[PDB]
Amino acid sequence: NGELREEFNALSQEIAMSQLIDLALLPLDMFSMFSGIKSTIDAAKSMATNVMKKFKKSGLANSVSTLTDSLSDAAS
């Protein structure tokens, strides 16, 4: 010993429907999400940690925080 946006958007035309509904019936968890993807032992140590750190700064996080703040403020 980039283009991924276009490729991901183009790949999204051929998925089946019945299997999609079947998978949407079975809930996932923190284990099934990454159990089908190969990982490097050095980086698999911090894989859930990084995605959760980036997710706590997501738009949905701001929306839920604002909703909670407005709900608590409404008790005045």
Binding site: L23, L25, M30, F55
Partner: peptide
Amino acid sequence: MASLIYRQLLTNSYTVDLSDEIQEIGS
């Protein structure tokens, strides 16, 4: 149902702080 993956994602997120603490020791 399958939406639960979102709900857990924001639930245990607090644990990152602990790891972040370790990260600052490793930073």
